[PDB]
Design a protein around this ligand. Structure first.
Ligand SMILES: [Zn+2]
Ligand SMILES: [Zn+2]
Ligand SMILES: [Zn+2]
Ligand SMILES: [Zn+2]
Ligand SMILES: [Zn+2]
Ligand SMILES: [Zn+2]
Lengths: 88, 143, 48, 167, 111, 197, 303, 158
């Protein structure tokens, strides 16, 4: 057809093939790594979730009980990294 | 009263001109840790932590890549001491990712459908004018 | 033997619940013909 | 003590079947591939205080879910009844070796962590911290009571006495 | 250490701001313990030095003979003076296996 | 038993106006509101300003009574169960008391699993004889007003601190001085005293 | 029918963009989105043996030589790798496009030549011995499909301008234009005789065009229907039977259409394909059809 | 004209004449819209598609942003293509998607910016609120009183 419509069809094929065959969309693309969080996040989560007697966090009351079956393992790593009397 | 350092060597050269503000940001973080949740939702009470962490990291990032006001040594001291985030900076140096909130808001393992948050969608491609508050972060449009 | 080994594996999966805890991303598509066609119901289509 | 430690070395060396090459499992790599886990970096004393609070919360959530409101788990992991119990309440609240063994593991970890906490508060010393940890790992059978809920730990406990005679 | 009815202390206010203490950390001679003194009491001592270990996985170490000499005379209190294993003639592993296979004990050995 | 089925049984005014739908499948997420045996929960977003609906009852409790799993209305006509049973017969007689309900559920599920898995098990022969008055009040266009977020209970007390970011509606709740506002789940399911019906 | 009823060829992790029959026809090699090319012996038990890696893109176009000794395929990263059928080693790689290579063809008979087309709007002629482009033909719109005539004089290119273009190797000029498609052309293929070229397009119609010294001048020789394209915008390729009697072309409706060469009548329309079909190929001796699709599986239909 | 209507999974390679000829005879009158449609499990026919992720989510977000999309049906009324949605805005905006540079560019909203991270209790990088739209939404002048009435009517029940 007209030159403007062919230009529009070319532009909306170039953008499509650009975003559809991007290098972050290949077959064995292992996506990015989970990174370190600010240390205050877990601190305020433990501070707000107190003795678990607040009503607001009652939906997490189930989850904590399940975490009981990993409390031996969480003990082991805790004592595996004890800091060595020459360390402060 | 200040942050206990873990280097025990003296801090580098230009330390004394960035310390009032770092301690003022550090005093600001200790406010947000101790705020009681009352009229703050369960996810909303963690939003100030990510905002102040963004701010501290942005401050060192501005003094080293924009203003050139700090050497490599003082820069890498602030990263080691926890004033700035090494991984958040490495994303800000990428091409599209330059006002990113969090590392949660680009993590695709954290979402149901394996995607970023709507935080990261350009406001021109929402085309509707809807208001956004990211649940991870509180952000309204990084990208 | 192929039919019985599958049920064997499904019974044996209970014995160790999480040693190398599970992994899941076969996110898939299904093409569905609603079978209660209306002019305005899907929006405008036979399938979804 | 030296003779018993020699016997332990010989029993280690004798019944050594080779490592039996398996498929590697990586529990913590499968936890942080999920959306329910994040990762940070923290002081060891802070994580130890966290682990003690979490285990305390787990054990008394197990108590409060079984409606056992007449029991009390104190902060040093002693389980005591609040009142005098009936026969039915005593038959109901009898725990097994799992609950008590996990409770005593948490008691030992809280002994270690509170030693580090009274170090980091500036209350004790560094040398007295070392001697306190040495007493903790030499006297588990006198400071915890783990032996009552699993008796085979005497194999460990005697061995620690042997090391205390060795050193 | 803490009483039974005492709630556990919060890290963020009781411990977070306190300077910890002096550690134990023996004073090293700056001339005699020279190739060791800069790094000997760090956590993972020579970790970010590519000449002595690889990377941050901290898996393979490569030291120099002055370093091994200094680490050897720092550790004399925990080591032995036995140059050859002829000391362990009847007192080694296979001898004790022969003793367990029979009813024999060794006068300084296991029963 | 469990249920463990793929792709729920949905109508078209609950499944949304988008032909392109994302839903999540949770394996044994909730229990049935009727059967109380746990099933596979499917959860999607219907449209843009909608509510994130999810399936409420089992595949089995929709096979027995020919309804959608979330709105509990007919698949073919789209009317309440008491209306469709009024325009037909009522010979199911599912038990409402506890042990009889689970016994009948086990046996009818055995009858389902001893068949193909495609038809209404008892409603088919009475579903041949149709086209009563119920065809003359069936809704032609989708009623997308169900798929709509709840009244903000902080805004009713005048304390909605989210304001414009709150996804819940800032509009009138319905007057409780109304027969149309009681509406139990089980009353709508078993065809007993449904005021809409 | 030779030992083939239907079978099933699997192994692929992504859509199978192309597959061609061994010049001999005894063996086969396929490749697609998986950046892997698969060779499965057609006869006996149909099992692959040699895999050819070395592609940082989608092995979009896959081809064979008249002999079939040398196989060359075109990837999406703007680089074409040339691999011999025997020993499977990247033997001659030619890199001259600034964008994705959409397709490639190898000249039969005459001294070795290779043509490529890409999203940069250019068409390039390669001599496998030079490690450099011989000629470059700037179009202006993205080029999707390219083939040589049997005389090795002309290059036939299909783009997104709905117009098949013919290039003269000596003049380096736009010799011919073909009108007749309403939308982008996705796949071109010459008859074994040189006589006719088969085209698929987004205009909903399979068109045969005749290329001859003496041409009617309006070369819409025949039109066939049934082949559907949709929102996936997959490149669609079509093939001639060994004797030129049958025409196969893949579709996005998972149906393997095969019309009659002389009467333009749908001879076959086989199913058994879950996802859109990307290429259909004919065995050179026997009536065997290899269908490749986005469902990552192959079938060996026997007629 | 040669093969059974539906059993499934033919072992030989069929012909177009031997599988797709229509069934002879009249339809039975003993089936409804649900029973006459080739349904798979009580509500329609569900089969595993293999649509590209990008194109699917492109059309999905195009509908969710505007209100139109292409048709993902296999054949439908036989025809190469058509659009499904609010069809009037498809040909208006030439059928663009979200992933493409738009035609319309006007009326952008205004918000704060203090991107410096130097002024404490003044920084808001990407947490910047709009200047026009505002927080807590107290309802109206009569909405409050009628909500007080409806809560009072709730109080007369329990
Ligand atoms: Zn964020
Ligand atoms: Zn976000
Ligand atoms: Zn953001
Ligand atoms: Zn049910
Ligand atoms: Zn419904
Ligand atoms: Zn609200």
């Amino acid at each position: 057809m007209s030159e403007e419509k062919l230009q529009e069809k070319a532009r909306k094929w170039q953008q499509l093939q650009a975003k559809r065959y991007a290098e972050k969309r290949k077959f064995g693309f292992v996506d990015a790594q989970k990174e370190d969080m600010p240390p205050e996040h877990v601190r305020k989560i433990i501070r707000d979730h107190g003795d678990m007697t607040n009503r607001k966090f009652r939906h997490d009351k189930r989850v904590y009980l399940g975490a009981l079956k990993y409390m031996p393992h969480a003990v082991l790593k805790l004592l595996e990294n004890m800091p060595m009397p020459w360390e402060q | 009263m200040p942050k206990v350092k873990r280097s025990r060597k003296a801090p580098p050269d230009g330390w004394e001109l960035i310390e009032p503000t770092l301690d003022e940001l550090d005093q600001k973080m200790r406010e947000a840790e101790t705020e009681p949740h009352e009229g703050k939702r369960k996810v909303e009470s963690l939003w100030p932590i990510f905002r102040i962490h963004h701010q501290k990291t942005r401050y060192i990032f501005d003094l080293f890549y924009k203003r050139k006001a700090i050497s490599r040594e003082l820069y890498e001291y602030c990263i080691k001491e926890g004033y700035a985030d090494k991984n958040l900076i490495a994303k800000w140096k990428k091409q599209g990712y330059e006002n990113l909130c969090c590392l949660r808001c680009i993590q695709t393992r954290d979402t149901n459908f394996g995607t970023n948050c709507i935080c990261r969608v350009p406001k021109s491609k929402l085309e509707v004018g809807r208001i956004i508050e990211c649940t991870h972060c509180g952000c309204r449009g990084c990208s | 033997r192929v039919a019985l080994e599958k049920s064997v594996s499904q019974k044996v999966a209970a014995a160790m619940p999480v040693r190398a805890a599970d992994k899941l991303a076969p996110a898939q598509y299904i093409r569905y013909t609603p079978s209660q066609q209306g002019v305005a119901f899907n929006s405008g289509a036979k399938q979804r | 003590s030296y003779q018993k430690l020699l016997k332990y070395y010989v029993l280690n060396a004798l019944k050594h079947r080779p490592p039996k090459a398996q498929k590697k499992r990586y529990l913590f790599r499968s936890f942080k591939a999920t959306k329910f886990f994040q990762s940070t970096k923290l002081d060891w004393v802070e994580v130890g205080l966290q682990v003690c609070r979490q285990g305390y919360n787990m054990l008394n959530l197990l108590i409060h879910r079984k409606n056992l409101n007449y029991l009390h788990l104190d902060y040093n992991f002693n389980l005591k009844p609040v009142k005098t119990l009936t026969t039915k309440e005593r038959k109901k609240s009898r725990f097994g070796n799992a609950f008590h063994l996990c409770r005593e593991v948490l008691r030992l970890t809280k002994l270690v962590v509170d030693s580090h906490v009274q170090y980091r508060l500036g209350n004790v010393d560094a040398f007295q911290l070392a001697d306190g940890l040495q007493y903790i790992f030499a006297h588990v059978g006198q400071l915890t009571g783990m032996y009552r809920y699993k008796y085979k730990l005497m194999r460990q406990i005697r061995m620690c006495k042997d090391l205390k005679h060795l050193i | 250490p803490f009483d039974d009815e005492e709630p556990p202390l919060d890290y963020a206010d009781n411990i977070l701001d306190v300077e910890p203490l002096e550690a134990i950390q023996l004073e090293l001679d700056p001339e005699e313990d020279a190739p060791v003194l800069d790094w000997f009491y760090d956590h993972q001592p020579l970790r970010d030095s590519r000449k002595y270990v690889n990377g941050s996985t901290y898996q393979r170490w490569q030291f120099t003979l002055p370093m091994m000499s200094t680490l050897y005379r720092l550790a004399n209190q925990l080591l032995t003076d036995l140059v050859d294993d002829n000391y362990f003639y009847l007192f080694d592993l296979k001898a004790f296996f022969t003793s367990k296979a029979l009813n024999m004990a060794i006068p300084g050995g296991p029963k | 038993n469990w249920e463990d089925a793929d792709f729920p049984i949905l109508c078209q005014t609950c499944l949304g106006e988008n032909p392109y739908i994302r839903m999540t499948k949770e394996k044994y997420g909730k229990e049935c509101k009727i059967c109380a045996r746990p099933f596979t929960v499917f959860r999607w977003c219907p449209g843009v300003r909608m509510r994130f609906k999810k399936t409420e009852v089992c595949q089995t409790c929709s096979k027995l009574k020919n309804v959608c799993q979330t709105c509990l209305l007919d698949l073919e006509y789209g009317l309440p169960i008491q209306v469709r049973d009024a325009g037909l017969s009522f010979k199911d007689d599912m038990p409402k008391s506890d042990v009889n309900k689970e016994y009948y559920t086990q046996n009818m599920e055995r009858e389902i699993s001893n068949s193909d898995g495609t038809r209404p098990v008892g409603m088919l022969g009475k579903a041949t004889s149709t086209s009563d008055m119920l065809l003359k009040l069936a809704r032609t266009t989708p009623y997308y007003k169900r798929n709509r977020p709840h009244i903000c209970s902080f805004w009713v007390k005048g304390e909605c601190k989210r304001g414009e970011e709150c996804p819940y509606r800032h509009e009138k709740p319905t007057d409780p001085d109304d027969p149309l506002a009681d509406q139990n789940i089980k009353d709508r399911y078993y065809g007993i005293n449904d005021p809409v019906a | 029918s030779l030992q083939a009823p239907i079978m099933l060829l699997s192994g692929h992790e992504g859509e199978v963009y192309c597959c061609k029959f061994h010049p001999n026809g005894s063996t086969l090699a396929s490749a697609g989105f998986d950046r892997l090319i698969l060779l499965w012996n057609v006869y006996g038990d149909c099992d692959n043996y040699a895999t050819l890696k070395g592609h940082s893109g989608a092995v979009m176009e896959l081809h064979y030589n008249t002999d079939g000794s040398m196989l060359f395929s075109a990837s999406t990263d703007k680089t074409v790798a040339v691999w011999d059928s025997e020993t499977g080693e990247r033997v001659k790689r030619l890199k001259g496009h600034t964008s994705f290579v959409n397709s490639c063809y190898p000249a039969r008979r005459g001294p070795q030549l290779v043509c490529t087309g890409s999203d940069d709007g250019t068409v390039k002629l390669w001599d496998i011995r030079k490690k450099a482009a011989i000629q470059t033909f700037q179009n202006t719109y993205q080029v999707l499909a390219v083939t040589f005539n049997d005389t090795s004089d002309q290059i036939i290119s299909g783009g997104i301008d709905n117009d098949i273009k013919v290039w003269d190797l000596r003049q380096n000029k736009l010799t011919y234009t073909m009108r007749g498609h309403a939308d982008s052309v996705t796949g071109l293929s010459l008859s074994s005789e040189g006589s006719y070229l088969l085209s698929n397009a987004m205009d909903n119609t399979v068109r045969v065009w005749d290329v001859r010294p003496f041409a009617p001048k309006e070369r819409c020789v025949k039109i066939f229907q049934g082949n559907v394209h949709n929102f996936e915008k997959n490149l669609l390729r079509c093939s001639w039977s060994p004797d030129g009697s049958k025409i196969a072309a893949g579709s996005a409706d998972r149906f393997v259409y095969v019309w009659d060469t002389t009467s333009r009548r749908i001879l076959y329309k086989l199913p058994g394909h879950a996802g859109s079909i990307n290429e259909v190929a004919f065995h050179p001796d026997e009536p065997i059809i290899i269908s490749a699709s986005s469902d990552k599986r192959l079938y060996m239909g026997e007629i | 004209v040669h093969l059974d209507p539906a059993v499934k999974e033919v072992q030989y390679n069929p012909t177009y004449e031997t599988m797709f000829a229509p069934e002879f005879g009249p339809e039975n009158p003993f089936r409804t819209q649900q029973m006459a449609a080739p349904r798979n499990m009580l509500s329609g026919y569900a089969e595993p598609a293999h649509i590209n992720d990008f194109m699917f989510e492109q059309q999905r977000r195009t509908f969710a942003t505007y209100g139109y999309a292409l048709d993902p049906s296999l054949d439908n009324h036989q025809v190469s293509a058509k659009y499904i949605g609010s069809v009037e805005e498809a040909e208006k905006n030439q059928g663009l998607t979200v992933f493409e540079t738009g035609q319309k560019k006007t009326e952008k909203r205004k918000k704060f910016k203090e991107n410096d991270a130097s002024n404490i209790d003044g920084f808001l990088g990407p947490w910047a609120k709009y200047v026009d739209e505002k927080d807590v939404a107290k309802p109206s002048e009569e909405e409050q009183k009628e909500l007080d009435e409806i809560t009072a009517k709730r109080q007369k029940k329990g």
